[PDB]
């Protein structure tokens with residue numbers, strides 16, 4: 001049975017084609033004092049330093065990436081890779097040389113019988129039961145707007161924003177520090193990440209919410225640190241993710257995610273824009289904030305012509321939408337002849353990936 | 359190579375398939391227009407143009423209770439069929455209760471809904487998230 005591995009900046013999501021979710025989700029890290037990977041690197045981080053092989057969605061350390069994949073096959077999925085066709089995912093606009101490298105490592109290092117690479121955002125659109133739409137995919141490392149028509153991304157219209165989950169975590173840490181707290185270790189970043197995931201939300205109207213926080217204590221929440229100290233989080237709860245709409249909060253001159261969605265749509269043929277506005281699909285961990293869909297609906301409505309039908313689709317399972325799309329694709333009776341086989345690789349070499357995998 | 363792709367769009371008419379456990383299975387001709395609301399279907403309307411060419415409209419119809427594997431598969435099968443037809447099909451998403459007038463016009467005595475359908479192809483799994491938060495002791499270790 002086929003495997004599905006969705007490799008991200010922050011987390012690996014791995015499993016078997018045909019399952020409704022990944023079997024294992026673990027951090028994309030290698031830690032050294034001879035090395036540990038994933039969940040065990042995380043749990044032993046007291047005595048290790050960590051490296052992340054994927055930066056802003058792109059693999060930049062191939063030797064550590066091989067360790068991550070070994071850990072996925074042998075430690076998490078507990079399979080012999082030579083027995084299983086393997087579907088991997090990639091970022092939009094992934095460099096051509098990277099696609100060839102992934103292919104080469106799968107066949108020559110792990111001896112897979114067959115392999116395929118798919119674009120993450122496109123898998124997410126398929127998981128939502130659509131062939132046309134615009135995906136907002138935001139993880140730990142990178143954010144993209146990917147417009148898609150009749151199954152295929154429109155490359156000229158893709159927007160990439162280097163403002164994602166890790167930047168949000170660092171900013172929450174900055175402003176919580178301003179409130180009087182202190183988070184001096186890399187280990188404590190993981191705590192601030194947890195606060196972010198449990199207590200942050202996107203305000204429908206940012207300036208009104210600030211006024212509420214200033215005139216009442218009703219937005220304040222408590223959070224218990226590992227040493228038992230209970231701290232208070234106020235307007236930081238919604239100031240943190242407001243950064244997605246106002247990147248000037250962390251010094252970036254970029255447009256916020258509402259404006260890049262609009263800019264992306266405006267780069268496409270006027271005849272498909274209506275279908276794009278009606279099919280905005282959110283995927284990835286950083287789209288998980290309560291309130292984000294309602295905020296996006298409001299902001300896009302404000303930018304678009306006033307007769308446009310606007311719809312935001314934010315599935316509850318969207319942390320795993322990419323993975324689920326791959327599970328579905330890999331399971332289809334029609335997909336059997338679409339894999340790159342080991343024989344095809346032996347005859348053609350890694351460049352085969354550009355002809356078999358859009 | 360899939361047998362149903364070989365049959366798709368060869369002559370003018372209507373063809374309907376139902377998604378069944380990650381496969382595209384033809385609907386019996388006498389049941390055309392009776393859609394299970396627990397399922398997802400793919401419909402190809404082939405029209406003979408006066409210039410001798412065939413015109414193709416591909417609709418994927420999503421029942422209100424169809425499972426995620428079914429609606430995802432309907433969408434993907436639609437892309438693959440369109441590609442097999444040299445991109446020449448126009449794709450239409452049809453949701454129960456909101457179907458297009460041209461889709462509705464394919465069914466001369468009116469399309470009808472019935473409850474039920476084929477079971478999901480997904481196996482249900484319990485994801486293990488292995489990303490533990492640091493203890494007091496781990497944080498103290500990094501300080502030193």
Ligand SMILES: Nc1ncnc2c1ncn2[C@@H]1O[C@H](COP(=O)(O)OP(=O)(O)OP(=O)(O)O)[C@@H](O)[C@H]1O
Nearest residue numbers: 008009010011139140141142165197284285286288
């Ligand atoms: N409930 C939540 N609210 C806000 N952020 C969340 C939530 N859940 C997870 N996140 C954040 O989502 C990110 C991980 O998401 P995801 O697995 O989609 O990213 P990734 O694939 O590893 O990274 P990328 O796509 O950028 O390469 C982390 O920054 C995490 O803190």
Ligand SMILES: [Ca+2]
Nearest residue numbers: 007008120139
């Ligand atoms: Ca990702």
Ligand SMILES: [Ca+2]
Nearest residue numbers: 396397475476
């Ligand atoms: Ca069904």
Ligand SMILES: [Ca+2]
Nearest residue numbers: 440445446447
């Ligand atoms: Ca087409």
